[PDB]
């Protein structure tokens, strides 16, 4: 609905920055609405969903185990590791790391997992293999959040990310059990409150992943829908704003309000 695009443009005005947006039909893959669908934006923490998808693919293939324990030390800790920080002693399982990476956006968890699969080059290779020739991971946390203007590193495009998410959640890529696990992690996201969740009506379903980075970078990927089932994928990215975190959250939430209103 174009009324939503009105809000997206308004957000651009308010934030004084580019906003990338896409509304995708989960079932058919049809693009319902878009704004800057093919411009690059830093993925930030949204990459974690793809990372865990790759992990799950290995689990499916027998090359990885969810129960496998990973040990790390103070040395591996990076900024913002609320979960990993508390488990230095006993370590954490792959499953727990994906949970922390997705639900709490634990940066260290993500790094550990990245290493585990072979690094950014491998995640990228994984995406390429699934038909995503746009999305690329080049660095680890925290560098991947630099958001240097015009830098293609660690970026995606709203249309690419939407499409990839659709494949991950509904394609034959992962086994059903792994698909569900991924969705369950995204549904349990605990740090995305002020975003789309704030505009979500009761009884609706939401599986998401937020992210923030330098240079006013903020974004969210989500699968949502009424009556406890997802039916659309929404991707929203922004970068370049000088606005405060709260200002950025509000705009994203208002975008969500509009998309819900015009459902
Ligand atoms: C992913 O996007 C992570 N972001 C940061 O570590 C980058 C950052 C944030 C603020 C200032 C400077 C750099 C984790 N993702 C977000 C998100 O999910 O909202 C957090 C803020 C939780 S950290």
Task: Characterize the structure shown.
- The protein is an alpha+beta fold.
- The chain has a single domain, classed as Beta-lactamase (3-Layer(aba) Sandwich).
- Helices cover about 40% and strands about 15% of the residues.
- The strands form three sheets. A five-stranded antiparallel sheet has the order 2-1-9-8-7, sandwiched between helices.
- Helix 2 packs across helix 4.
- The termini are close together.
- The relative contact order is 0.20.
- Bound molecules: open form - penicillin G.
- Open form - penicillin G binds next to strand 7.
- The PDB classes it as hydrolase.
- Keywords: beta-lactamase, acyl-enzyme, penicillin, class A, hydrolase.
Structural class: alpha+beta
| N-C termini distance | 8 Å
In the CATH hierarchy, what is the superfamily? DD-peptidase/beta-lactamase superfamily
Number of strands: 9
What percentage of residues falls in helices of 4 or more residues? 25-40%
Taking all Cα atoms into account, the compactness measure Rg is 17 Å
- As for the CATH topology, it is Beta-lactamase
- Sheet with most strands: strand arrangement: 2-1-9-8-7
For the record, the CATH architecture stands as 3-Layer(aba) Sandwich
Element string (H = helix, E = strand): HEEEHEEHHHEHHEEEH
CATH structural class? Alpha Beta
Judging from the principal axes of the Cα atoms, what is the shape?
Answer: globular
Number of domains: 1
List the bound ligands: open form - penicillin G
The main sheet comes to:
5 strands, antiparallel
Our count of helices gives: 8
Strand content is 15-25%
